[PDB]
Ligand binder design. Structure first.
Ligand code: L6T
Ligand code: L6T
Ligand code: L6T
Ligand code: L6T
Ligand code: MHA
Ligand code: MHA
Length: 901
């Protein structure tokens, strides 16, 4: 197809422009990094709700007209010391004056403080309930300035240190903002843990995979450049659209490790090509094509896995999707630009340093034992994996809670103690946001209409249970427009699980003539977000599976192998998900890992599907692409499966561990979503690297035999010219379809075929006419050029076999190397080639490197380097590589020895 041509071209190009390529990109990545460390201050917490939903609309209109609810912003429990009681007016006058001072110094941050302590002598029942009956505790509400979740949080964090200093420190902060501050604060300490724990462990695995530090350090450097540039990109993205807090760790959680993984396969392929006698220039090229195709494909596949998340309306998922795309794409680009150019500069110098630089057939035999008893391995694996999908039915979803923090988090407990000491104040009522399209006020009888319709609905709370007093109007503060065209009534909920049922019932209520009813509230926001997820989820899965399977099909050529991978990834997914619900819903490991068993966040299930599927699909490509390579190379399905396994065995383990290590740092996050996400990686990865790669894939793949490989769509993949000795010497000696004079001035034609040494052109035409058995008047076709070439080769080979000095080395050589030997014979004759007694002897003993080195010291190499180097490289590698990608064209044509007639 189209894809195989470009990687070749780019392979020669990264070498031709090494220093420029490595200079521009590192500058950009470091430039991005310096630009992208400011990411963290242009970062949002919002985006968990469905922006196009009625609840959000109800919220928007509600905060617009009535003012946003700031009563729950900051809540502070106060405890007088020395067992003094809250009613102690001496303690009151001192504490309140402290409070007034904090407000006085921060009017740009704090609206004020509300509570019993402001007017201790009130018979207002609700206000008098802001103190416990034992008079040991009293709480205040501290509404903050700001017009979005982010500004309000920043305002809290400004006043928090001085606020915590109230009452001699004996004050406990809780509410929306102390939790938000703690929840978002987990990001910063999760990455620090990654720098402290993950980074040194990555270096160990990196050095484990390779044998030297330079080869080990390069993927690490790529990862860092990927992070830097991706953070820079994400910073740029923050200029045009909100970027969530959670986007940052995703860059390091996913991008880094995957960037290391990509770099791991490039350096390993380069090292592998240098192991063969390939030039540095050649190694980078071949490496780039093979590895790049897999890495480039792997990146696009993850992009194809992340893009479907854009179907979901949660801005949370959009920011993360961008971050993933930016990361893995920059990773792929870096791994075939900066890294390739670096290897081109280094060459074999990658294997310079060893463990000692101090300053400060297992897979072979593991894969074949499986193959002849594949079903003994398949069946039990698939049963468990399906049985690991059984805890999935218990999966539940919910909104953000204080339970998202660990049970021993001080801020979570301040909250849990607020709800324990003051049980009534924490409410989440459903709202009926009424809006007349008409611009005139809503009458009292019009609200009476809606209340009557609302009182009809069954399960709303009735403390103080008169219906008249149910569905109170939402409190209005100074931030509201107070437009009489909009009025909001709200009631709490009885039994709060059933919100979806009663929300949908509130919307089924027919609005009094001429009004649009917007049903909102925290459970409404959360429910709409959940419904939005389930709605776009079947479509996501569709696009997710199709795009990746198609991409794997362009990467493999097989139709079956990609479809096989789809089922594999689906079962890896379903199994990993079941274990997670087993872990985070049923709470298995919750004690060990210090998290609370609870419903999972709805958009989190979208993210984890995409990440797992994309990661699972990549690790199939990492493995199968080699198998495919083997088959294309031409091998039975059996050994094709094996070759692919043994070649990538150590590599995929290291690639897995490096990613597993970083994930294993994030599993210790105080944020359950992060814990949950990080575990999804580990579990899916461990299942992929072991159960899938080593057992289930090679087992299955053999069952299909050669059916696994390309099946249908004949001609979908193009058979390609298989290089030959003519094409070889077409390059070295030229292909001329018309009689011409060579450098010695003699009439030559075809591939270095001397017609005659006669000055007479007609004599040459006469001999040419004779040779083709047809009047040519000096012109032949390509077929006749080959026909004549083959006679010359036959003559060359005949004489070679009659030469005692040439026959033994020739008989021992494979077809390709024979062509190189024949090439030499053509250029200098048997006696000329026979003069190479030692190198011939080295070739007969298959000491290619020794022969290649010794042949380069010849006068033959000196007088004709490009052809010699081409022939020598062919001896060394035994492949048509030096000819399949030769530089240019040759200018001086010379007729060869052994012109037959
Ligand atoms: C890294 C993980 C971090 C997780 C952070 C979660 C911690 C607690 C969340 C804090 C949310 C503050 O909730 C309180 C507010 O909720 C709604 O407004 C919010 O929802 C609307 C529709 O979306 C938006 O229009 C408003 O801008 C937006 O303030 C209400 O209308 C407001 O009356 C109320 O004040
Ligand atoms: C996940 C985190 C969840 C955290 C949950 C936290 C919920 C906290 C709820 C706090 C409700 C406290 O409300 C306190 C009271 O303030 C105002 O009283 C007025 O008293 C004086 C005479 O009017 C004047 O100073 C002012 O006009 C005004 O203060 C309202 O008029 C009352 O109706 C309201 O009851
Ligand atoms: C090398 C690998 C490269 C990989 C990098 C991947 C990054 C992809 C980033 C895609 C983000 C595109 O942003 C899309 C968003 O932009 C818009 O802004 C404009 O509309 C806003 C109101 O909507 C107003 O504030 C303004 O009029 C205006 O700025 C809106 O926010 C969204 O309606 C829209 O969805
Ligand atoms: C499969 C391949 C292997 C991959 C796994 C590699 C893992 C590498 C990272 C491991 C670093 C260990 O970090 C230990 C972390 O825990 C400590 O105590 C806490 O421990 C649990 C929560 O962290 C709870 O017990 C409590 O909340 C609290 O006591 C500190 O609070 C943290 O500061 C410290 O960072
Ligand atoms: N193949 C060669 O270049 C051998 N030459 C050169 C050498 O290796 O000394 C000498 C010989 O004829 O044995
Ligand atoms: N004559 C040329 O320009 C090509 N050169 C190639 C070279 O110098 O190595 C000689 C040949 O191929 O016969």
């Amino acid at each position: 197809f189209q894809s195989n041509a470009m990687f070749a071209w780019w392979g020669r190009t990264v070498y031709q422009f090494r220093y420029i390529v490595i200079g521009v990109m590192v500058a950009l990545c470091l430039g991005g990094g310096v630009y992208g460390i400011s990411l963290g201050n242009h970062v949002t917490q919002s985006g968990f709700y469905d922006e196009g939903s009625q609840s959000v609309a109800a919220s928007l209109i509600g905060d617009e007209v009535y003012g946003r609810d700031r009563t729950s912003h900051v809540v502070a429990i106060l405890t007088p010391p020395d067992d003094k009681k809250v009613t102690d007016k001496a303690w009151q006058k001192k504490v309140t004056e402290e409070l007034d001072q904090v407000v006085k110094d921060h009017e740009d941050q704090i609206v004020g403080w509300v509570g019993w302590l402001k007017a201790p002598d009130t018979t207002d029942p609700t206000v008098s309930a802001m103190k416990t009956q034992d008079l040991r505790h009293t709480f205040i509400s501290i509404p903050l300035q700001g017009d979005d979740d982010d500004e309000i949080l920043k305002n809290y964090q400004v006043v928090e240190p001085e606020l915590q200093q109230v009452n001699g420190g004996d004050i406990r902060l809780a509410g929306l903002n102390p939790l938000a501050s703690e929840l978002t604060g987990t990001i910063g300490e999760d990455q620090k843990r990654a720098e402290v724990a993950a980074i040194p462990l990555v270096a160990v695995v990196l050095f484990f995979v390779f044998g030297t530090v330079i080869a080990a350090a390069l993927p690490a450097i790529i990862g860092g450049l990927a992070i830097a540039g991706a953070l820079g990109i994400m910073r740029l993205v923050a200029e045009f659209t909100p970027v969530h807090f959670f986007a940052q760790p995703v860059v390091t959680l996913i991008g880094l490790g995957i960037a290391i993984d990509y770099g791991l396969f490039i350096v390993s392929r380069f090292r592998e090509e240098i192991a063969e006698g390939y030039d540095t220039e050649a190694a980078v090229r071949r490496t780039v094509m093979t590895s790049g195709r897999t890495v480039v494909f792997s990146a696009v596949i993850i992009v194809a896995s992340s893009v479907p998340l854009l179907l979901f309306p949660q801005g949370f998922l959009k920011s993360i999707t961008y971050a993933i795309i930016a990361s893995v794409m920059l990773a792929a680009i870096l791994s075939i630009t900066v890294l390739a150019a670096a290897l081109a500069i280094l060459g074999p110098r990658v294997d310079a340093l060893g463990v000692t630089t101090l300053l400060k057939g297992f897979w072979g035999r593991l894969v074949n034992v499986v193959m002849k008893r594949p079903i003994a391995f398949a069946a039990p694996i698939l049963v468990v994996m399906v049985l690991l999908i059984i805890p999935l039915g218990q999966l539940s979803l919910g909104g953000i809670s204080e339970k998202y923090l660990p049970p021993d988090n001080a801020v979570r407990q301040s909250q849990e103690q607020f709800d324990k000491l003051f049980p009534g104040f924490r409410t989440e009522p459903l709202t009926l946001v009424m809006k007349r399209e008409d611009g005139e006020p809503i009458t009292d009888a019009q609200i009476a209409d809606m209340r009557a319709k609302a009182l009809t609905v069954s399960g709303f709370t009735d403390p103080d249970n008169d219906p008249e007093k149910m569905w109170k109007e939402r409190p209005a503060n100074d931030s509201g427009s107070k437009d009489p065209s909009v009025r909001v009534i709200q009631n709490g909920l009885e039994n709060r699980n059933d919100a979806a049922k009663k929300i949908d019932e509130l919307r089924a209520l027919q609005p009094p003539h001429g009004i649009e009813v917007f049903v909102g509230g925290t459970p409404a926001l959360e429910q709409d977000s959940i419904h939005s997820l389930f709605d776009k989820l079947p479509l996501m899965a569709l696009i997710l599976i199709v795009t990746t399977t198609v991409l794997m099909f362009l990467a493999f050529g097989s139709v079956v192998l990609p479809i096989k991978a789809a089922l594999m990834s689906a079962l890896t997914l379903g199994s990993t998900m079941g274990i997670l619900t087993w872990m985070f819903v049923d709470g298995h490991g919750s004690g060990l890992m210090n998290y609370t068993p609870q419903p999972l966040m709805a958009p989190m299930i979208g993210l984890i599907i995409a990440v797992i599927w994309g990661l699972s699909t990549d690790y199939e490509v990492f493995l199968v692409s080699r198998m495919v390579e083997a088959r294309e190379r031409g091998m039975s399905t059996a050994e094709a499966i094996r070759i692919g396994t043994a070649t990538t065995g150590r590599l995929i383990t290291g690639a897995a561990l490096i990613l597993a290590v970083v994930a294993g740092a994030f599993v210790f996050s105080d944020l359950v979503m992060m814990k949950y996400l990080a575990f999804g990686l580990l579990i899916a990865l461990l299942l992929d690297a072991t159960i899938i790669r080593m057992f289930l894939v090679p087992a299955v793949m053999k069952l299909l035999g050669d059916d696994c490989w390309w099946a249908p769509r004949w001609m979908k993949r193009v058979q390609e010219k298989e290089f030959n000795i003519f094409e070889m010497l077409r390059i070295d000696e030229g292909l001329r379809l018309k009689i011409y004079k060579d450098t010695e001035g003699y009439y030559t034609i075809g591939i270095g075929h001397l017609l005659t040494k006669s000055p007479s052109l007609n004599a040459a035409k006469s001999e040419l006419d004779k040779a083709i058995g047809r009047n040519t008047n000096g012109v032949i076709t390509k077929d006749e050029a080959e026909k004549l070439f083959n006679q010359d080769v036959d003559a060359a080979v005949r004489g070679i076999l009659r030469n005692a000095k040439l026959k033994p080395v020739y008989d021992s050589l494979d077809a390709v190397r024979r062509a190189a030997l024949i090439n030499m014979v053509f250029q200098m004759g048997e006696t000329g080639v026979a003069g190479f007694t030692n190198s011939l002897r080295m070739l007969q003993q298959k000491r290619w490197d020794e022969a290649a080195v010794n042949l380069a010291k010849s006068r033959w190499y000196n007088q004709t380097p490009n052809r010699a180097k081409r022939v020598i490289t062919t001896f060394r590698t035994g492949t048509w590589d030096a000819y399949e990608f030769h530089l240019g064209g040759i200018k001086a044509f010379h007729h060869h020895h052994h012109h037959h007639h």
